[PDB]
Each structure stands twice: as structure tokens, then as C-alpha cells.
């Protein structure tokens, strides 16, 4: 046979501290539905000194989707095999591409992370590429997720922003697939992280996440807003969650959706979105009792309210920076 | 300032002979329009003991196209930049993907090659990825290329198989593009190889090609049909050129197109395809005088005619190895 030795490529940050990388490294992949707390959790991990996640890469989910189109089509599958493009070849190529993006698009760290929501649809395949990677699947009440998508007009291919029922059916199908991928991998490899629980109990849930990842505790994860303020956590000013993740963990988004779902969909909730009850969200409750907030997050929420003017300044400065760029795009045309 | 070293990954096989590989290796990229002699020239190189090209990969040009779709769309280019996906990052990922495919889909060799026709539309970008790669651009009379496409019903996105004029205009645009890329790189990097001249004068043209690539002459390149017969050259039974390249270099396809172009297109030829004259093909001639055939290729042509029943058998065995697969594809239904 022929064997392909891939020694460790590496990263040198300042002071020549070496950071080797290969497919066997203990990567962290975070995903789930868009608008389910995925940026929050990756920013809380970025706040840890040992972990770097950084911004959404966009190219990783797009490559994974294109690869699915190839191997799903029987004729193309056969053409690839007859060209020598076996699974072993395609996996080597895909893993190399993905690993280069993760390594190079941010600063080095002892543990590297990626967050691109729909990568968790491909978690079983990513475990084949990266055998020691671990996965965090964000879970959030589908009614909150769809309310966010619709009120913030987040564009997702195939989501009809005029239609709550259609978006909840899409949410339901996506989460059925992602939850199944997660459980196929099992608890040694994939941890479901419940958004409302993480918000209500950030110290206990961050402890649980860090234990699962085998990363020591650090209180720095409870001060992520300060590290954003001094550019210690990388954000894209074009991502839609930036103006929320700049704030401390807070209670404001748990149940904003209540009373904004059309009555026929509230009636049909259990049939429209059966993943709600499967995941622990009562489809008859508007809202469920997600639990009692820790004093830490009650205090954060009160302090944000006291600084409402400071925060609205930052949220407007952000939309201003969004405006400069949509100028630089009408000028690129 | 972050430095990213990538030590030589390598191949080893029988006797543990090491073959290191990285982006600086002297790769060979072959391309041009489909139906221009690209499989012939890659098979003549495969006949050299130092060079391995192998079958079309398909995924390499498809990834190149997807990358162009990203960077050319101004909104998407801005989102990538604000995610940290700089050209430096994207180039590292693209080069890693393409290199893994080239290395792993075939047997190892001192010099690795790839042939996928439309990669040469991206030759300037590939030189950025692989600075010591060299390029061969096949050139063939556009009338012969379009006749082949239409008569053999070769599906190419955007080519109307019922319309010679439209196909010749597509050919003309594609070759203006590929020829421009080749000349941007210049003669130290890209050699135009004329199909009709390679067929008429194989010893002198293969001398020129091998000197350009810095590979020593070997008479094996004039015996490629024998090396196919003992499995020293990899062929896809699903590629449309396999039944032609199994024969010795021969004269039968130089001017088959003559008398098969609609009258009105013949009358308008210089206006329909101005690239013909630019490349040296007289658009007023049906056919141009491509030159005088070497006696080597005249003799090959005569011998093929003598063994026509032996060649008909292999052509049939290829069509039947095709139907076995087209059964296995409707079985996937």
C-alpha cells in the first residue's frame, strides 16, 4: 500500500511559542440553528485564555454543503470513484481545507474552536475528519428562534420571513437532524447546551461545558463583555448577533417571543414543532418556566437597564459601521 | 505577526520511498477546452516514469468555481473579510485542498500532474497558490473542438448541442480567457501546446514539452498505448476520451469536422470565432493545412486501420463497462 505521513504544521505567535496542528487535534465545533445563542457561547469560550473561536467563517459550511451535493448524486458519485476520488481522498482534502481556515483566520490558542451554525448538520462527517474534535450543539426554544429570525429579518435560504408556521416547520426539521447527529456521536463527543439554562445559570453551565471540553475553569468567562471592549475577542461587525453579544449575559431574550406568534400556530404548536416537547420545551406553555435566574444574571440585567443610554450608543455606532460598509458595496458596484 | 510553518507531509509506498509534498513543489497543471487533446497530452506525460497525472478529479475545477463565486460577489467578499477570511487564509485552504487531491488520488511519482480542462481559466490564481507549478494550455482548432462537443454530445454547462454557432462563440470566449491567463503568466510558466502539431510531430513536441517541464527525455512517451495495456496509466472508464487515448497517436481526428459545419457558419467563420486567426488557424480554410505528418504518426494511423477489429472490440468492451455502471446508477433509484 501507499501511506501518507502528514507531520505537524505549526503556528508561531509572538515569542516563538509553537502551535502545531493536524487532523487529530482536539478541535471544538459549535453549531445549531442560527439565533439560538451560538455567538454567545462561542464568545464565552473565547473569553477563556486557552480557547480561541473567532468569527463565523461562512466558507466551512459552504464547502460542506457542496461536498454533500457531490456524493449525494449517484452519477457524480460514480464519476468521482472512477477518477480516483475515494472517500479517503475527499476526506483528506476537505479536512485540510477546513483545518487551514480554523487555524489561520484568528489568533493562535491551545484549543481552537469554530462556530458556523449549520456545521452541526454535518457533525458525524466532521467526526470522521477530526476524530478528537468535540461538538457543542446549541438548543433554544424554537419559538424564540423563529421570532428572532422573523423580527430581525435574518435571511436563511428556504425560510419565508412572512410565515411563522413555515419557519417553525423548518426549525423543527433542522433540529431533528442536528439533534440526531449529536446523539449518533454520543455524550463523549457532543454536548447539547440549552440556551435558556446557560443564560439562567452561567457559572454552572460554563463549568459543565469546560469540563466536557477538558479545559480548566476560569472566571474570565463571566466577564466577556470587558474582553470584547479591548479587542480580546474577535467580532464581525456584519454578523447579526454582534449588537447583543457585546452585553454581559442577561435575561432580556428568553421570552420576547411570547404573544407574537399567530393564534393558529399557538394552537397547532405541538404538531407544527414536535421537537419542542422532545427537547423539554412544553408546546402548550407561553412561555415555559425555563427556571429561576441566578443572582449573577439578575444583577447583570439590572445593570444593563441602568446603562440603557450607553448601550444604545454602542448599538447605533454598530449600525453606523454597518452603514459605511453598505456604502462600500454600492461603490463596489 | 504570526508565522505558520508547514513541514513536508509526504507519501511512502513500497520500500518506504518518501515523496514529500507542499505548495512549493513543481506541480504540472494541464488544461484547455474540453475536446482539445487534454487527455492525450496528460496520458503521454503519464507514460513517462517520472510523471503521474491520472484521471480528471472534477472537484478541483468545481472548488475553483465556487471560490470565484465567493470573492466576486461584493457583499460576500466583505462578509468574508470581516470574518477574518483574508486572501491569505482562503489561499491556504484552497491550496491545501487541491494539493491533497492531486497527491492522494493516484500513485506517487517524482513529479505530480493534474488535468482538469477548465482549471486553466484560473491559471494566474493557481500560480499564486503554487508558485513553482508549470502550466500546459492545449490549443485545438475551435471548429474541431465544437464538432467533437456536438457529435459526441459532450455536456458542458452553457453549450447548446443543437447550435454550432453558439458553441463556437462559447469556444471563442473561453479560449480568449485561457490564452490571456497563459500569456499573463508568460513562457517561463505556461506553454501553449497545439493539438494538431503534437499529433503531426509527436517526437519534437514531446521533446519541447518535457524540456519546458525540466523532465528528461524518455522514449516511453511514444509507446503510451502499451503502458495503458499493462496498467501503468490510470484511466476513468466514464471519461469520454478514454476510447480514443487507448490508441497510439494518430491522424484520424485532425479534420473530421470539415463539411459538418452549417454553411452559414462557414461563411461567417472569421466573425464568429476571431480567436481562430489569433491562434494561427485560418478561418477561411476548410481545413487549414496543419502541416505534414511525421512518418511515425502516418504508420500508427495505418496500423490502427489494419487492426480495426481489435480496436472495435476494445471500444465495445468500454461501452459495456459503461452500461454496467449506468445499470448500477438506475439501481441507486
Amino acid at each position: 500500500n501507499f501511506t501518507y505521513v502528514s507531520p505537524d504544521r505549526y503556528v508561531l505567535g509572538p515569542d516563538s511559542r509553537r502551535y502545531p496542528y493536524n487532523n487529530d487535534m482536539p478541535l471544538i465545533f459549535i453549531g445549531g440553528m442560527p439565533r439560538s445563542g451560538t455567538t454567545l457561547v462561542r464568545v464565552l469560550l473565547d473569553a477563556h485564555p486557552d480557547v480561541r473561536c473567532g468569527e463565523e467563517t461562512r466558507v466551512i459550511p459552504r464547502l460542506l454543503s457542496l461536498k454533500q451535493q457531490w456524493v449525494k448524486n449517484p452519477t457524480e458519485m460514480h464519476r468521482l470513484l472512477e477518477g480516483g476520488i475515494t472517500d479517503e481522498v475527499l476526506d483528506a482534502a476537505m479536512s485540510a481545507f477546513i483545518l487551514e481556515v480554523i487555524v489561520r483566520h484568528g489568533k493562535p490558542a491551545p484549543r481552537l474552536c469554530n462556530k458556523d451554525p449549520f456545521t452541526l448538520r454535518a457533525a458525524v462527517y466532521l467526526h470522521r475528519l477530526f476524530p478528537r474534535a468535540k461538538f457543542l450543539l446549541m438548543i433554544r426554544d424554537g419559538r424564540a428562534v423563529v421570532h428572532s429570525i422573523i423580527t430581525r429579518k435574518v435571511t436563511i435560504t428556504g425560510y419565508d420571513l412572512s410565515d411563522y408556521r413555515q419557519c417553525l416547520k423548518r426549525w423543527n426539521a433542522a433540529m431533528t437532524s442536528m439533534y440526531a447527529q449529536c446523539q449518533q456521536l454520543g455524550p463523549g463527543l457532543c454536548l447539547p447546551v440549552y440556551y435558556e439554562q446557560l443564560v439562567l445559570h452561567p457559572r454552572a453551565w460554563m463549568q459543565r461545558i469546560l469540563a466536557f471540553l477538558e479545559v480548566p475553569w476560569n472566571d474570565s468567562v463571566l466577564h466577556h463583555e470587558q474582553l470584547i471592549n479591548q479587542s480580546g475577542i474577535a467580532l464581525s461587525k456584519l454578523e447579526r448577533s454582534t449588537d447583543q453579544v457585546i452585553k454581559p449575559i442577561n435575561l432580556g431574550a428568553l421570552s420576547k417571543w411570547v404573544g407574537h406568534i399567530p393564534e393558529d400556530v399557538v394552537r397547532d404548536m405541538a404538531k407544527v414543532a414536535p421537537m419542542l416537547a422532545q427537547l423539554g420545551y412544553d408546546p402548550a406553555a407561553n412561555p415555559p418556566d425555563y427556571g429561576q435566574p441566578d443572582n449573577f444574571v439578575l444583577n447583570n440585567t439590572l445593570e444593563i437597564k441602568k446603562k440603557m443610554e450607553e448601550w444604545q450608543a454602542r448599538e447605533r455606532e454598530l449600525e453606523e459601521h454597518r452603514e459605511l460598509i453598505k456604502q462600500s458595496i454600492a461603490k463596489k458596484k | 505577526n504570526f508565522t505558520y510553518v508547514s513541514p513536508d507531509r509526504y507519501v511512502l509506498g513500497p520500500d518506504s520511498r518518501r515523496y514529500p509534498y507542499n505548495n512549493d513543489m513543481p506541480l504540472i497543471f494541464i488544461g484547455g477546452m474540453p475536446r482539445s487533446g487534454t487527455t492525450l497530452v496528460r496520458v503521454l506525460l503519464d507514460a513517462h516514469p517520472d510523471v503521474r497525472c491520472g484521471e480528471e478529479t472534477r472537484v478541483i475545477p468545481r472548488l475553483l468555481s465556487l471560490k470565484q463565486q465567493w470573492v466576486k460577489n461584493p457583499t460576500e467578499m466583505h462578509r468574508l473579510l470581516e470574518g477574518g477570511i483574508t486572501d491569505e487564509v482562503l489561499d491556504a485552504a484552497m491550496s491545501a485542498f487541491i494539493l491533497e487531491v492531486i497527491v492522494r488520488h493516484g500513485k506517487p511519482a517524482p513529479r505530480l500532474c493534474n488535468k482538469d480542462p477548465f482549471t486553466l481559466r484560473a491559471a494566474v490564481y493557481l500560480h499564486r497558490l503554487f508558485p513553482r507549478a508549470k502550466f500546459l494550455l492545449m490549443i485545438r482548432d475551435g471548429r474541431a473542438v465544437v464538432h467533437s462537443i456536438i457529435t459526441r454530445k459532450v455536456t458542458i454547462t452553457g453549450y447548446d448541442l443543437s447550435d454550432y454557432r453558439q458553441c463556437l462563440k462559447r469556444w471563442n470566449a473561453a479560449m480568449t480567457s485561457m490564452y490571456a491567463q497563459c500569456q499573463q503568466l508568460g513562457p517561463g510558466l505556461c506553454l501553449p501546446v497545439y493539438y494538431e502539431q503534437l499529433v503531426l510531430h509527436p517526437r519534437a513536441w514531446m521533446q519541447r514539452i518535457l524540456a519546458f517541464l525540466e523532465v528528461p527525455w524518455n522514449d516511453s512517451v511514444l509507446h503510451h498505448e502499451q503502458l495503458i495495456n499493462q496498467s501503468g496509466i490510470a484511466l476513468s472508464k466514464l471519461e469520454r476520451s478514454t476510447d480514443q487515448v487507448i490508441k497510439p497517436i494518430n491522424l484520424g481526428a485532425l479534420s473530421k469536422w470539415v463539411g459538418h459545419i452549417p454553411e452559414d457558419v462557414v461563411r461567417d467563420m472569421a466573425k464568429v470565432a476571431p480567436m481562430l486567426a489569433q491562434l494561427g488557424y485560418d478561418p477561411a480554410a476548410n481545413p487549414p493545412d496543419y502541416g505534414q505528418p511525421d512518418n511515425f504518426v502516418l504508420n500508427n494511423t495505418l496500423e490502427i486501420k489494419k487492426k480495426m477489429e481489435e480496436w472495435q472490440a476494445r471500444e465495445r468492451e468500454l461501452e459495456e463497462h459503461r452500461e454496467l455502471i449506468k445499470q448500477s446508477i438506475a439501481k441507486k433509484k
Binding site: 442560527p34 461562512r58 435574518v154 435571511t155 436563511i156 435560504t157 | -
Partner: peptide, 6 residues
């Protein structure tokens, strides 16, 4: 391109 694609 949309903000996201499944």
C-alpha cells in the same frame, strides 16, 4: 448569498 444557508 443569504446570511445563512442550511
Amino acid at each position: 448569498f443569504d446570511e445563512y444557508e442550511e
